[PDB]
Swiss-Prot record, chains A, B:
Domain of life according to the entry: Eukaryota
Coiled coil: none
Subunit description: Interacts with CDC42; the interaction is demonstrated with IQGAP1 in GTP-bound and in nucleotide-free state. Interacts with RAC1. Does not interact with RHOA. Interacts with TSG101. Interacts with PAK6. Interacts with TMEM14B; this interaction increases IQGAP1 phosphorylation and induces its nuclear translocation. Interacts with SASH1. Interacts with PJVK. Interacts with SLC26A4; this interaction enhances the chloride-bicarbonate exchange activity of SLC26A4. Interacts with SVEP1. Interacts with ILK; the interaction is required for localization of IQGAP to the cell cortex.
Record localization: Cell membrane; Nucleus; Cytoplasm; Cytoplasm, Cell cortex
Known function: Plays a crucial role in regulating the dynamics and assembly of the actin cytoskeleton. Recruited to the cell cortex by interaction with ILK which allows it to cooperate with its effector DIAPH1 to locally stabilize microtubules and allow stable insertion of caveolae into the plasma membrane. Binds to activated CDC42 but does not stimulate its GTPase activity. Associates with calmodulin. May promote neurite outgrowth. May play a possible role in cell cycle regulation by contributing to cell cycle progression after DNA replication arrest.
Residues of the full protein shown: 28 to 191 of 1657
Taxon lineage: Eukaryota, Metazoa, Chordata, Craniata, Vertebrata
Residues with the Phosphotyrosine modification: 145
Tissue specificity remark: Expressed in the placenta, lung, and kidney. A lower level expression is seen in the heart, liver, skeletal muscle and pancreas.
Protein known as: Ras GTPase-activating-like protein IQGAP1
Calponin-homology (CH) domain ranges (all copies): 17-132
């Protein structure tokens, strides 16, 4: 009975990993390049490069690839996050505003850059996917709730990450 | 400078009130009846009656108006929530699953019944609205961010509610 609030927690972690995995595959399907491992996707979206590319994918008229800061992430891999990376997240936000995705789904720059609330970012990706799909601008995102598994260590890691 | 994290907080509350107002009007537009005041909408969705009605509106195959418990909410007005109201929320959930709304957006029964996380409910309504609109089953939800105002007292009440 007391272990219920300890197993339900395991479930949340698992479900979030599935949603992450789904976001990862869909972005890859759209971008045509590999994204970091599902287990490291959150940290891998922080510099906003992938998001800005996603923006270019559906709203090219608003997000030019040549104007993305550290497009190859060489700077990021080398020194880490830089204040200028924030512009990338903003380009993505502008991309979504251009195509009509309702703002209630938008995360704040800090939510992704300072990783204050990455889940909010994932949820937005998912909503953007549903919106893009209905406009016939991107493939449908997958649903992997039960077809995908993760090691006990990964669920455990995600669990503690979703708490403290 | 210290009042920034106290004004930004005011903004969040305001934004949420706008989202609630938008969900309220859209549901009314779909249902053809009045819903409680935007300021009391959250508490007013707890018994799931309006949600089940929303369910019947887009998936009558799954939700029969006659199988909604306390459809007139007479029980509710008399005595508060009753365990049997939980079924209404569940009918709404089944409605969404039937039309194919991605599960990532679904709140848990407890989130709305025990009011553990009503915002999750509101965000789901918005995703549902976006989806239903693309299916041509319902009118488009409005964007009221700037067009609408609330009293200071209301912004304030919502603010403290969104914290402790």
């Amino acid at each position: 009975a007391e272990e219920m609030d300890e197993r339900r927690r395991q479930n949340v972690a698992y479900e979030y990993l599935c949603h992450l995995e789904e976001a990862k595959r869909w972005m890859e399907a759209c971008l045509g390049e590999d994204l970091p491992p599902t287990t490291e996707l959150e940290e891998g979206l922080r510099n906003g490069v992938y998001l800005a590319k996603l923006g270019n994918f559906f709203s090219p008229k608003v997000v030019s690839l040549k104007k993305i800061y550290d497009r190859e992430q060489t700077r990021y891999k080398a020194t880490g996050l830089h204040f200028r990376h924030t512009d990338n997240v903003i380009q993505w936000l502008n991309a979504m505003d251009e195509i009509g995705l309702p703002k209630i789904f938008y995360p704040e720059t800090t939510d992704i850059y300072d990783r204050k609330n990455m889940p909010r970012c994932i949820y937005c990706i998912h909503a953007l996917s549903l919106y893009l799909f209905k406009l016939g601008l991107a493939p449908q995102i997958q649903d992997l709730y039960g077809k995908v598994d993760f090691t006990e260590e990964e669920i455990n890691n995600m669990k503690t990450e979703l708490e403290k």
